[PDB]
């Protein structure tokens, strides 16, 4: 069975953790989380050798009450605990904090609804009512999705991707109508299949990208008046495109992750030519994240239960026959800590090389590869 091979390979991983990691923490959550994002704040403790970092998590339970979660993590300047539980209707598909106000968190639900929460407007412990009380309900979609991106340059601008083939755009600062409701400012109808992900450009407030099951990458400009035709249509992959992410240091670079088992690299100055293709055997990629500290570093996760960390600067490098046996030199590190599909991961923005990854079997891991692997 696959479960016997997984338990055995986990024990081999577990025993080798002192030789691969400088930091590795494992925590079993009450429910699996489909989402993971570090909050930007760090609370320094007076006289203690640790600092307190926070994570946005969610639950995925079908019989019981779901929650949006704020977890605390003690990291060196080892306890992980839930600080805040907020009732959520259905599982939290994705939860992301507003870059201009980290108290504001948007969530994707297993319904048409896109919700906005201000966690400071809620108690730490939820009421036994079972009622989901978001501060805003964003209208525009017909179906659920996962794709969610806040505009880092234009305060309150949020993009969402849906199974209904559309991309919605909201301005959450707009005057709400009826019951805390905001209608979509625009709906982008370029794709002819389920939209898997959306991402704003990190420097140009009017530019964003989208990826879908139609195997395309679309580049959009909100300054254009036609919301059915993107600026560019890129024939990015040979299968469904599940994710995309813009490089936080280069204003021209972005990555796409796909069901065709690859991560593609793109330059906005030359979209007709794919810069590079990172390949990993029998791994349908669902998440790609650039390092917030190092321009050439990005990580990916798919269905193979591993987390791959890539280094762009090592492409086309000479390798010893021994090293070459582990794979291409651009494959910097493999994290084999999980025993189920990784649902999401997030780079710690305050402590370089620290990552939080969450899997389908309810495990959350906080880890950092050995300083040695990258230096």
């Amino acid at each position: 069975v696959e479960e016997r091979v997984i338990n055995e390979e986990y024990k081999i991983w577990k025993k080798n953790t002192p030789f691969l990691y400088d930091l590795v923490m494992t925590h079993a959550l009450e429910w699996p989380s489909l989402t993971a994002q570090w909050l930007p704040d760090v609370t320094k403790q007076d006289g203690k050798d640790y600092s307190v970092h926070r994570l946005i998590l969610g639950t995925h339970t079908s019989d019981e009450q779901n929650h949006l979660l704020i977890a605390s993590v003690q990291l060196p300047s080892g306890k992980i605990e839930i600080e805040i539980k907020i009732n959520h209707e259905g599982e939290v598909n994705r939860a992301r904090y507003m870059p201009q106000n980290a108290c504001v968190i948007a969530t994707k639900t297993p319904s048409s609804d896109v919700l906005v929460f201000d966690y400071t407007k809620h108690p730490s412990k939820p009421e036994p009512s079972g009622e989901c009380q978001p501060d805003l309900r964003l209208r525009g979609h017909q179906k659920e999705g996962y794709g969610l991106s806040w505009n880092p340059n234009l305060n309150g601008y949020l993009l969402s991707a849906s199974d209904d083939h559309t991309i919605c755009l909201w301005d959450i600062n707009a005057t709400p109508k009826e019951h805390r409701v905001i209608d979509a400012k625009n709906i982008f109808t370029g794709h002819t299949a389920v939209v898997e992900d959306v991402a704003w450009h990190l420097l140009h407030e009017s530019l964003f990208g989208s990826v879908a099951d139609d195997q395309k990458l679309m580049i959009w400009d909100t300054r254009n008046n036609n919301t059915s035709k993107p600026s560019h249509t890129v024939d990015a992959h040979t299968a469904e495109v599940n994710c995309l992410s813009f490089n936080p240091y280069s204003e021209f670079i972005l990555a796409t992750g796909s069901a065709d088992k690859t991560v593609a690299l793109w330059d906005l100055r030359n979209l007709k030519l794919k810069l590079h293709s990172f390949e990993s055997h029998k791994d349908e990629i669902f998440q790609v994240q650039w390092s917030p500290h190092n321009e050439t570093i990005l990580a990916s996760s798919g269905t193979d239960r591993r987390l791959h960390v890539w280094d762009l600067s090592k492409i086309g490098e000479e390798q010893s026959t021994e090293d070459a046996e582990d794979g291409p030199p651009e494959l910097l590190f493999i994290h084999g800590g999980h025993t189920a599909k990784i649902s999401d991961f997030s780079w710690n923005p305050n402590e370089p090389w620290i990552i939080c990854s969450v899997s389908e079997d309810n495990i959350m891991q906080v880890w950092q590869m050995a300083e040695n692997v990258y230096n």
Partner: peptide, 13 residues
């Protein structure tokens, strides 16, 4: 499907 890269083990470096 490797668990880790043998080149990333501290004792192999």
């Amino acid at each position: 499907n490797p668990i880790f890269l043998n080149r990333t083990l501290s004792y192999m470096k």
